[PDB]
Amino acid sequence: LRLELAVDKMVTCIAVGLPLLLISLAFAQEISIGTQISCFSPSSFSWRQAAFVDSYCWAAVPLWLHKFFPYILLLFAILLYLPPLFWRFAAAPHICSDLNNLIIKYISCRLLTLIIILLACIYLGYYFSLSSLSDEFVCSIKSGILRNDSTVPDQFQCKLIAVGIFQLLSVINLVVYVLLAPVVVYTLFVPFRQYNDLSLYNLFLEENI
Amino acid sequence: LRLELAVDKMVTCIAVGLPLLLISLAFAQEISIGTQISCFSPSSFSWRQAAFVDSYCWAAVPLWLHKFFPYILLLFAILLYLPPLFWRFAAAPHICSDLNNLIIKYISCRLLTLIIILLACIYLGYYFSLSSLSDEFVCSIKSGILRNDSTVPDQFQCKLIAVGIFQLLSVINLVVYVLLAPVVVYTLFVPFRQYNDLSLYNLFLEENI
Amino acid sequence: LRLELAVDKMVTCIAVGLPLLLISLAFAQEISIGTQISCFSPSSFSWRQAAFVDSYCWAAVPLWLHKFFPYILLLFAILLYLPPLFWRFAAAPHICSDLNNLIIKYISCRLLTLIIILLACIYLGYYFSLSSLSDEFVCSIKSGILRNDSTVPDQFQCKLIAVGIFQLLSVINLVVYVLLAPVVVYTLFVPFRQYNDLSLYNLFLEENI
Amino acid sequence: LRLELAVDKMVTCIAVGLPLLLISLAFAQEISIGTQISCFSPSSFSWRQAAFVDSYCWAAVPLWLHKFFPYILLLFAILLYLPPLFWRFAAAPHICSDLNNLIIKYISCRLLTLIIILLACIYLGYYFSLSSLSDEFVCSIKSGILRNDSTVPDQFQCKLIAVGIFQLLSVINLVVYVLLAPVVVYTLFVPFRQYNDLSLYNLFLEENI
Amino acid sequence: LRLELAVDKMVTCIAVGLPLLLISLAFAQEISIGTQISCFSPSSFSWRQAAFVDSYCWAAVPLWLHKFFPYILLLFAILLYLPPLFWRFAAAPHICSDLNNLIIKYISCRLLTLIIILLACIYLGYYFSLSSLSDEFVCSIKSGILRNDSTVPDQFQCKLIAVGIFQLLSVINLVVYVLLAPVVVYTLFVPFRQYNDLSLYNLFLEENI
Amino acid sequence: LRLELAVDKMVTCIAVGLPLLLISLAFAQEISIGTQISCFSPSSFSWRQAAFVDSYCWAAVPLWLHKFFPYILLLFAILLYLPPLFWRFAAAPHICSDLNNLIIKYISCRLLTLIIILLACIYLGYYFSLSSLSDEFVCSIKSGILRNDSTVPDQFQCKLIAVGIFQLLSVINLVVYVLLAPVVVYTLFVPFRQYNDLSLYNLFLEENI
Amino acid sequence: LRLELAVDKMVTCIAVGLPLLLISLAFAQEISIGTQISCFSPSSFSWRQAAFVDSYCWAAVPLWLHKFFPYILLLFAILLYLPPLFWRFAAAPHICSDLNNLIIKYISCRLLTLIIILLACIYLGYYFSLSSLSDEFVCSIKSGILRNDSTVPDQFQCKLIAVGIFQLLSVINLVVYVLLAPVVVYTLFVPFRQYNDLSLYNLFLEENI
After folding, report:
1. B-chain residues within 8 Å CB-CB of A58?
2. What angle do CA C160, C162, C163 make, to 5 degrees?
3. Which of D20, D31, D55, D65 to mutate to test the interface with E (most CBs of E within 10 A)?
């Protein structure tokens, strides 16, 4: 009682399990120290003031990708998990009853998977292409009531920490997602791997006998 | 043995699972540093005094939305989970026996779902519309016995930290909830998707055969 | 095999599940900073002395409600869970055998539920009515051997932190418990919702057939 | 297949479940700050020296009840759980076979339960009766090699913290245990609630039919 | 299908479950502060130096019993769990087949249990008998390269903390183990509680019928 | 119902379970202190500045192997788990039906396993061969706005901590993987351990009878 | 359906369960303070510098046994678990079919168990024999850029902490493993405890009937 094609199931399993694995690896205890951002406060600040400076410049951010990278990986995971979820609803009644129109549904689902994979490839290539030294910046807490007093200085050098691991994991993800696309575009050609529904039924009964 | 319509079940599953997912994402270890609020205490304060200042100005709050945002998302989740819970009690006896008045119950439940979705859309639009720089304020601990002594200063610049993630997640939630409403208003029109009970029974037996 | 009435079961489930949910929400990591009380110790005290001052003024307390609020909510939960627990023992033998005197037991249980709900309403109204600024006070550690030395000062401004969330959650609980009472007083009128036992048996067999 | 009397089972369940619940409530995160004892060390002591002073005066203790209160509640729980455990061994063979001497066993078990309940009442009354201000004392670390040096002072004011919650929970426990005793002494009178074994068999078969 | 005697099973269950319960109680969060040992370092030492002093004098230890008390309780638990474990191997074949020599095995197992109980009684009496003030000592870190420099002083007063709880729990354990021995020595007399195997078979079939 | 050869299954189980075990052992609480990297900051820096220096020089890195060693072990584990995963898909249909071409699949899978084992051997030999003193380096935070000020010095000696355990675990892994290769190359010779499919079927039915 | 001999199974269970139990006991919260190593840094070092000194001298190590003792115990556990694992593969086919050559396999497995037990005895005797005062040493951080500056001193006294517990647990393990060897060498003599396969089959059917 198998409702899917083994190659397509393996592709869906890999494409959605890789970014969650990279999010799990990027913040492991093994590879990473405790603080995400760090700003060099002067030597007249207490603990609480330097914590205020770090917490302010962390919330005062180009650099949007460096902060929200795990959320973007999770978004790619969800948007890539959606096409098989849409496929299950349209498929399981008709195949549960039997075992044209289903060719359109199957081709559109695999097409959406291919487009999401290509957009992930473009985004990860853009993320790796940018300068590694473009992870540090100059923050200024002087705002509001702190605009006139000369106790604090103007510029604060701030540096994100977990960005090099993000570069490396995006390289790994891009390397996987580049060679993942020939498999899905080979499964795109429905009548040759044995556009009518009869061919789809043939390739759905060859493994469910 | 299915007691519901697949499209309505999917809509209920998404509308109540999205805000809990956003609450889970907004306070993840990955995206967020440890302290919610931060106030710049002067450099003559110990740790405990600056902790007192932060704990006072956190409890001395417009800004009500910036503090109670997860509770409001949880309230929207609960108020949106209530209509299917009311539907189950009125439905499962009559449909469990069989498989006018039920049209009124079904239409009122979907109407309440639509109204809650629209109110969530209005609230999230209001929450995103306000100024991003309107997250910081000027707190004053001078009250009670601390009204006359000149050891502490008058104004304390305070800043909330997790507010930008709240803006972004409210944008995502609004984007989902805008396009969610055409689906529920399409399911609102009961006789065309095949106001008498016979049509409801037809669309409840087409998927439970 | 249902031993209860659906409306009464839902009422019992809500009335005992709401205060536990509010206790769970009031001390969540999301909404609340780490320390309950905070007292402004002078700038010549070490960490341990300020911790002693906070721990002394926390244990040197009108303000009784501000400290023991979760215990009072738990007490209302337990006292409201007791009437159905008493109902089960008197009911399940007679109804398990069959399916006057039971009218007295049922009416007394619902009456006790109504009285507990009304007392909860009165207490939460009293708790919300008091001044929000009446959460801070003036503590004095000068007692015992510390009565004569002039190293420590006399007055210490102390402030409770989690009190505004208590005001808001008591408002929510009062709003629910006000509109909960019409339902239980409607279920109080036993012969009209179809004082003899025959009517109770009719309304216990209409849903268990 | 019920081997007990419902009223006695409920009494045993309450009498042993209340003190464990009070021990669980007295040290909850909600109600209680982190440190049990606190001593005001002078302002020339480091962290480690004040920790040594607190750890010494915590282990240098009338006040025995204030330190070992949860252990005494656990002891009352165990000593009150012992009579039904003794009852099970003597009862389950004879009742498992059948369904004088058993009257003696049943009366002695309920008598021991009554005596333990009364001793708990006396102890909790004594614990509540003592002065609330009798929780703080004067400790002296000057002993051994620290008997002659004048770097440390003689007297240290020390204060226990979790004692007021102990007073309140002992009041609650006493209030429950006072009204618990009429129920057990009513179950003590074996022939009237329908000293021969025949009456015990009658009241053991009326609920196991 | 019971392979044991109820009284002996209860005795084995209590004698091995009490010391584990005391080890669990002696280091509970409720009763005990965080640090086991504490040494009064002078007021010119940083945190790390005082931590070095405490960690050195904790590892530079009469006092052997005060440090390894939970390990000795665990050793008594294991050595008292061994006789029933030896009994099971020799018993379960012969009794599983049937239901002289077995009298020797049973008497030797109960004898070893009695000897272990008596040795535990002697050790706990010795542990309680010693002076309560004999828990503090004078440690000297001056060794190795730290033998000539006069920056650190010679004597350091050190104090163990969890020793009074050890005295109290050893008193409780001794009180239980004294009155436990009449039961096991009553079970030692095999023919009277109804040395031949026939009597053992009689007292093994009276409860397994 | 066994779908594999016992020797090959044991080899796959060991080759993928050893590096995960070494990753688990290298960061155990037992063997390792809390901080991975450590840099000697001057004695005019606060806590937060030294934490900034450590967090900067940890993210400013030959030495790539010393930082990403657990990820490389995980990569070897995954790349060595892939050949049996590929074998299962091609094998389980044909063997599930039956019990040339399968010789090619089996030989290619075992060949890929051998190549991955050899590459792991070469990498671990290279990792052990390098100097143990080549774990410490000279970091410079002077960049950006911190290029001209003379408050901070130029050179910072930094040292990785968990590298010696990495040397030892790579030695252990190399010792295992050297003697693992004779077993897999003995299983490579398919017709002698009883290239046609008939011999493979003989050695797949000798253990599944 | 028992595939083993009870005495041999008990021996394997004890010999592999004892070192894991000792590793679990040596790092328990009860017996051990938080830091493994400790070095007396001078009183002009901040927290981070003393943490750097401790982390450097912990990674700059005769003394190899004092650092890697749990790994060596785990290695003895694994090397002692290997002979029964090898025995299962060679035994379970032939005994599962039936119930010379098996005498060789059984004798070689028990011989390897005896050799591993003897090597463990020799190693633990060597570990206990060495001086208890040989746990402290003199470390020098002066290397690299820190070779010429006179801000830090040359010698640092360092001390391992958990070594006395290692001595005691190795004594316990040696005491067990000495008296464990007569049992395994008694099971080594196969024909007397009833070298041909027939005797092995006799002693494998006497307990599996």
Report:
1. 33, 161
2. 75
3. D55
Q: Do chains A and B touch (3 or more CB pairs under 8 A)?
A: yes
Residue pointed to by tokens 């809390």: F34
Q: Do B138 and A145 touch (CB under 8 A)?
A: yes
Q: Which of G5, G9, G17 is nearest to G78 (CA)?
A: G17
* Interacting residues of G208 by C-beta distance below 8 A, sequence separation 6+: G1, G2, G99
Is residue E137 helix, strand or coil? strand
Structure tokens at C101: 């005197």
Quick one: which of F61, F73, F72 has its CA closest to F36? F61
Residue A126 counted as domain residue? yes
Q: Is F183 left (phi over 0), alpha (psi -120 to 50) or beta?
A: alpha
Q: Flag if A145 and B136 touch (Cβ within 8 Å).
A: no
Q: Between the CA atoms of B136, B142, B144 and B150, what dihedral angle is there, to the nearest 10 degrees? A: 160
By C-alpha distance, the chain A residue nearest F45 is A43
Q: Do D51 and E41 touch (CB under 8 A)?
A: no
Of G33, G43, G168, the CB nearest to E36: G33
Question: Counting Cβ atoms within 10 Å, is residue D49 exposed (0-12), middle (13-18) or buried (19+)?
Answer: buried
Closest C-alpha to C161, from G116, B101, B37: B37
Residues D70, E31: C-beta atoms closer than 8 Å: yes
Cα within 13 Å of Cα(D130), Cβ side: 18
Name the resolution in angstroms: 3.8
CA distance E133 to chain D (A): 9
The total domain count for chain A is: 1
Does A23 contact B30 at a Cβ distance shorter than 8 Å?
A: yes
Residues paired with residue D39 on neighbouring β-strands, in sequence order: D158
Is residue E15 assigned to a domain?
yes
Residue G185 lies in a domain: yes
Beta sheet of E136-139, edge-to-edge order: E37-39, E156-160, E136-139
Whether the CB-CB separation of G164 and E58 falls below 8 Å is answered with no
Residue E56: closest CA among G61, G33, D54: G33
How distant is the Cα of C134 from the closest Cα of chain B, in angstroms?
A: 11
- DSSP letter at D44? T
Is residue A34 within 8 A of residue A56, CB to CB? The reply is no
Chains that touch D (3 or more CB pairs under 8 A): C, E
Residues of B within 8 A of C136 (CB-CB) are 143-144
* Chain A residues whose beta carbon lies within 8 Å of the beta carbon of residue F143: 136
Question: C-alpha angle A140/A146/A148, rounded to 5°?
Answer: 100
Expt. technique: cryo-EM
Are G37 and F24 contacting, i.e. CB atoms less than 8 angstroms apart? Answer: no
Q: Across-strand partners of C139?
A: C156
Contact at CB, C44 and D45, closer than 8 angstroms: no
Looking at the domain assignment, is residue F28 inside a domain? yes
Phi (first) and psi of residue F158, to 5 degrees: -120, 150
Q: Do E46 and G50 touch (CB under 8 A)?
A: yes
Query: Which range of residues forms the domain containing residue B109?
Result: 6-205
The phi-psi region of residue B144 (left if phi > 0; otherwise alpha if psi is between -120 and 50; otherwise beta) is: left
Q: Are A124 and A174 in contact (CB under 8 A)?
A: yes
- Are residues G58 and F33, on separate chains, in Cβ contact within 8 Å? yes
Q: In Å, how far is D196's CA from the nearest CA of chain E?
A: 26
Q: Rounded to whole angstroms, what are the CA distances from D168 to B177, C65, C71, D16, D171?
A: 50, 13, 11, 19, 5
Structure tokens at E97: 């087949």
Which CATH number covers residue E200? 1.20.1440
Neighbours of G87 (CB within 10 A): 21
Residue G149 C-alpha, separation from nearest chain F C-alpha, in angstroms? 12
Q: CA E4 to CA E23: how far, in whole Å? A: 28
